[PDB]
Amino acid sequence: TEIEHLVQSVCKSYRETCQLRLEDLLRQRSNIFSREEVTGYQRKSMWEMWERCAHHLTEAIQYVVEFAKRLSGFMELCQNDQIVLLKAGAMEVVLVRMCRAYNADNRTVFFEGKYGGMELFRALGCSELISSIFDFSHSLSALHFSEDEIALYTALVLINAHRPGLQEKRKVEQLQYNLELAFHHHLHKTHRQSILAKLPPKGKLRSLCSQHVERLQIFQHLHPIVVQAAFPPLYKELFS
């Protein structure tokens, strides 16, 4: 029963920190940016679009930081390992969470109140990277992740004892094994083990995420935003 409590605890932590409600996102799908509104975004300076997207991305990260802080055992890890896992994993989770806000039928994402395609972001001059991010969401879309599946999967994205730099590797392994059992137990209970063979290769998410964060650090270097840090040790690593 300790595992069934873990399943419930992870799904609750996700429910409290998912940022956008799935029902709102599904019902808002017919609300799509017009030709004119899309041109309004394309005409904004790179630096204004950077400011908008940087702040949306930091805020999304902060919801993932909160999600992690409510996973059982995460806070009992030493602070160095908290940073290690979140630095490597929190943006991976944001990229996974994107698929809920992404409509595969027209290849649009929910952005500032409406759905728009990737050409909304033309002014940023990162079409290849942004296209990669949209492609990743598109492939995740085919799984039709339930809310509980995405809760358990993104927990496992964070709690990964293979991250370089961990000090108490055994403690992370214990949490990881419990979450893996929780995930696999729940998939069996719901007759959804078929998604296992369809999850993305682990190297794919890490590769895409490194390219994403790389571009973000280049913008941040040219045009630094600042936010009130949720997790200052983690913040002061990437922004300072």
Ligand X SMILES: O=C(O)c1ccc(-c2nn(C(=O)c3c(Cl)cccc3C(F)(F)F)c3ccccc23)cc1
Ligand Y SMILES: CC(C)CCC[C@](C)(O)[C@H]1CC[C@H]2[C@@H]3CC=C4C[C@@H](O)CC[C@]4(C)[C@H]3CC[C@@]21C
Chain residues that interact with ligand X, rule: CB under 6 A: 54, 57-58, 61-62, 86-87, 90-91, 213, 216-217, 220, 225, 227, 229-231, 234-235, 238-239
Distance of alpha carbon 58 from alpha carbon 104, whole angstroms: 25
19 counts as binding ligand Y under rule CB under 6 A? yes
| Interaction partner, residue 61 (ligand Y, ligand X, none; CB < 5-8 Å by kind) | ligand X
Contact partners, residue 149, CB within 8 Å, separation at least 6: 143, 186, 187, 192, 195
Distance of alpha carbon 225 from alpha carbon 239, whole angstroms: 9
Which 3-state string (H, E, C) describes 102-170?
A: EECCCCEEEECCEEECHHHHHHHCCHHHHHHHHHHHHHHHCCCCCHHHHHHHHHHHHCCCCCCCCCCHH
Footprint of ligand Y on residues 84-103 (CB under 6 A)? 94, 97-98, 101
Footprint of ligand Y on residues 140-199 (CB under 6 A)? none
User: Minimal distance in Å, beta carbon 195 to ligand Y?
Assistant: 20
Q: Closer to ligand X by CB, 44 or 69: give it.
A: 69
User: Minimal distance in Å, beta carbon 38 to ligand Y?
Assistant: 13
Q: Closer to ligand X by CB, 186 or 212: give it.
A: 212
User: Minimal distance in Å, beta carbon 226 to ligand X?
Assistant: 10
109 counts as binding ligand Y under rule CB under 6 A? yes
Q: What angle do CA 13, 57, 137 make, to 5 degrees?
A: 80
| Strand-pair partners of 114 | 111
Q: Closer to ligand X by CB, 198 or 236: give it.
A: 236
Q: Which of 38, 46, 57, 161 binds ligand Y (CB under 6 A)?
A: 57
144 dihedral zone (left: phi>0; alpha: psi -120 to 50; beta) = left
Are the C-beta atoms of residues 123 and 41 closer than 8 Å to each other? yes
Which chain residues interact with ligand Y by CB under 6 A? 19-20, 53, 56-57, 60, 94, 97-98, 101, 109-111, 121, 124, 126, 129-130, 133, 212, 215-216, 219
